[PDB]
């Protein structure tokens, strides 16, 4: 048995694995930042790990181009000469292999972020349709915002229990919603209050608006904000440059239409064309356009 | 009788209905957000509901293309298999169909917003002129800012009477203008203070400038601000992408004129054309340009 | 006698009147907003008014085109039927003709802002050079910020002495700089403190950055800020759209040079041109480019 | 001996002198602003001054063009009549020449910033590669943000020992991090706290976001922010205008590929091409594109 890389199954499988990479890009950074000390998420997370292992076996049973190559020896060698290393490191369950506290074991599952490479390889499939690349550009923006929300909470939570004298962003969140910390550094805002504030501040930093209630005070928070002003000015110019270019690509029929309509309209004015002829020129352009695009 | 879809009457009637759709887009969300619990505005609201019913009668009596079709049976069946459902739901007077508190009758009149579809149906008329497209783009921006101001006041007003402990944006507005709420959660800012502050905050969010006085504190206000930063970055890349394109399209006389005058001037400097001949080249280009555009 | 409109005198005079229009555009709005009830700014204002009256005599003695028309009667009729009405209204010496209080007379001298039309008439001269239209664009941006600073000070100063309860931007300025207003309306910030703050707030609003210290609190300050958010967005779609285009126009020879160099370079790589030949191709491109642009 | 200006030694030397000009552009403004009244950095600072003197001797032995000129006497007089004056003043040992405080000597050594002219000359080398001009454009942005951070600290530090009355940005910093300034002016924020806050405020100002904690209060701070809103809106639009153009230039093969692929895709749909012929058309287009770029 072997799967053809252009078959309708392999198309549906690559679009299914895109959604499981988006699940990984959301819930791995979130669990590593907010949750370090069956449940519905624990069974879903195991299902997703099993499907990323099935995808390794499919990559030993799929054709490739040099026209098609269809022999299991030449297929398995092509995978071992390239991506099989990264696809295996993205799948080794170190949680079942290491014991050294459970903080390290829970953090080590960040190795799953190598699954983003399965989206970097397959841009030949995903970038073919203009409506699908708008979804990838908005998910790239919302995932850059989410990963920065996890780094920003890690930076805050590694300074909140310090000899901080109540200066870092989490102590100010405690005051601002009426949920102050105890003198022990314990209690205070919930995980929803802290995550929603960390995502709000990083969309605020990336889209360059500051409403004044969350702001960086410590040197680590200021250095993070300088880095997010550099990331924001590159990535927002590149992403919304590409979103504008793809919107201009989708609008390009109407953009060419109004341009050629203005040529015909201005030619009619310049020659002062009589009405019985004028209607025939304008109706002809509407016919020749709606026939040929 | 029958109306031609290209007649000067049907042109004026479509440009009149645009102003009644802009009236609907302003005053229906405003009434549903700020006024729920005759005036000159109430008799005008009835007159506008009557004119949107008269427009259904005109749609049963207009010719259409699928060359023109003029037979009333083929007109009626095309409308009934087309927009008549949406046009009728936009015209139902729910005041006469429901009797069970008054708040349901007030809120259900948001079904009038289906009248926005009467603009999207007719972009062939409405988008023909660059001077009309600039008006529609700046009204679409100012209407998105207004609809978000109605949603932002609903989010504030659905938390202000709660067990809030004075954290939401309406309590802060009361303090910031010297109009605080009494212990019952009553009194506070006026409807003018609350509307002008909501509209100020959503233009502030959409144009990405935060002056620091209005800011989102509760998780619903932060999640709304995350949504307005996503909407605002797509909308500002699309609307102000198109507004600058329409400005540069209307500038396409001057842009070609400067570029061609520079090509001629650099040709003159490269060949070092003597003054007796040079003026003939530049005066010819001014004549040929002002003749041909 | 008569002056030829292309002569070096008339060229130097038109570029001198641009500087006197820029003087008018700065110092008339400033005096009419900040300084309502010899010194250098009293005597220079008379010297400038005389030069704007001398310019009316030059317009009665200059050639025009409808080749040139040079007859003094056909010049005088062409000006009397054209711009002379506006140039006369922009010259009436109300200081010497009204006695009716000074608070009206100082405001009535804002009629001098009709001198801005003497620039709109002459864009054929002033737009000829790419470096001169960059100067007009940066002076237009700085003048829009200055005129808005005068409107923002008028809005602040027309509410500060009201039953305000210390809410308008001028009371907050007094508190922030350690120069508080007394309850009598006495003391408070100096005219430099009030002007530099109003110019800062309107560059802040137009470039969409809010540092959090000046913010609009009263309903008129919020309605002003909504107008500046609508102005600043149309202006960035237009002024900084044009500054981008003019900077790319100054860079256009170099932008074409790199584009054509990469086409030569990729042709050389695709054919793998040997070194003895390759230099003769890529040095010939540099010779042909530097010789001809 | 003489060095050929195109040789692989002289290429590596000009890229090494770029990195030493970046060292000068960082550490000269910083030392003149923050460090005013051998050491591990003073040895590096001397080594770099030696290499900027060695570069003058290399320029007395480098060939030049008007085909190449090889003769040392024609080389020397061309350098003496050209850049030698600026290159020499950029290398005078001002450590040795004054006895007149260290406060003058540290200010005087800002003349080393004339080494930026060595990069302004050689843009024929440095701009050749698109990935090198991306590195230059992000270094120009980070260096403008750093030079402004040094001017902003010079403003705050010159006003702080005046009759400031706790209004200027450094007294606010002292309070906001819990390191308040003592009545004798001793202690307060460290040089890391003051520099990281100064750099944070200038990236904040240039990228037009204000998080509300650092803000300009005094008139000189506000006039500086007006200048950074002018410099920011010109430089950010020109730098990220050029980064946008360079990212589009590097992507241009793929942008052309999508444009031409969608012409072929629309042509195939318009003519309704059968599958046996369709595959031959689009497989030919991919074979052709991957061969010719």
Report on this model:
- Chains A, B, C, D: The chain crosses the membrane at residues 7-27, 40-60, 82-100, 105-125, 132-152, 223-243.
- Chains A, B, C, D: One of its GO terms (biological process) is cardiac muscle contraction.
- Chains A, B, C, D: Belongs to the potassium channel family. H (Eag) (TC 1.A.1.20) subfamily. Kv11.1/KCNH2 sub-subfamily.
- The structure is a homotetramer of 293-residue chains.
- Chain A folds into three domains: 1-126; 128-250, Helix Hairpins (Orthogonal Bundle), CATH 1.10.287.70; 252-292, no CATH class.
- Chain A has 13 helices and two strands; from the N terminus they run ααββααααααααααα.
- By secondary structure, chain A is mainly alpha-helical.
- In chain A, strands 1-2 form a two-stranded antiparallel ribbon.
- Chains in contact: A-B, A-D, B-C, C-D.
- The C-D interface holds C 138, 141-142, 176-178, 192-193, 196-197, 199-200, 203-204, 207-213, 240, 243-244, 247-248, 255, 258, 262, 266, 270 and D 127, 165-167, 204-205, 208-219, 222-223, 225-226, 229-230, 232-234, 237-238, 241, 245, 249, 292-293.
């Amino acid at each position: 048995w072997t799967i053809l890389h252009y078959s309708p199954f392999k198309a549906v499988w690559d679009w299914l694995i895109l959604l499981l990479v988006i699940y990984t890009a959301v819930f791995t950074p979130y669990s590593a930042a907010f949750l370090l000390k069956c449940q519905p998420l624990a069974v879903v997370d195991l299902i997703v790990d099993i499907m990323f292992i099935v995808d390794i076996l499919i990559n030993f049973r799929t054709t490739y181009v040099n026209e098609v190559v269809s022999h299991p020896g030449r297929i398995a060698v092509h995978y071992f000469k390239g991506w099989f290393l990264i696809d295996m490191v993205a799948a080794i369950p170190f949680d079942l292999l290491i014991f050294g506290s459970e903080e390290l074991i829970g953090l080590l599952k960040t190795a799953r972020l190598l699954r983003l490479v399965r989206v970097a390889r397959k841009l030949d499939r995903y970038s073919e349709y203009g409506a699908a690349v708008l979804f990838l550009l908005m998910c790239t923006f919302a995932l850059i915002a989410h990963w920065l929300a996890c780094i920003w909470y890690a930076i805050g939570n590694m300074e909140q229990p310090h000899m901080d004298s109540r200066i870092g962003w989490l102590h100010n969140l405690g005051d601002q919603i009426g949920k102050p910390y105890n003198s022990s550094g314990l209690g205070g805002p919930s995980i929803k209050d802290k995550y929603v504030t960390a995502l709000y501040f990083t969309f605020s930093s990336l889209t360059s608006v500051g409403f004044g209630n969350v702001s960086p005070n410590t040197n680590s928070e200021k250095i993070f904000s300088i880095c997010v002003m550099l990331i924001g000015s590159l990535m927002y110019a590149s992403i919304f440059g590409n979103v504008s270019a793809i919107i201009q690509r989708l609008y390009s029929g109407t953009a060419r239409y109004h341009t050629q309509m203005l040529r015909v309209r201005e030619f009619i004015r310049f020659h002062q064309i009589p009405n019985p002829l004028r209607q025939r020129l304008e109706e002809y352009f509407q016919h020749a356009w709606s026939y040929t695009n």
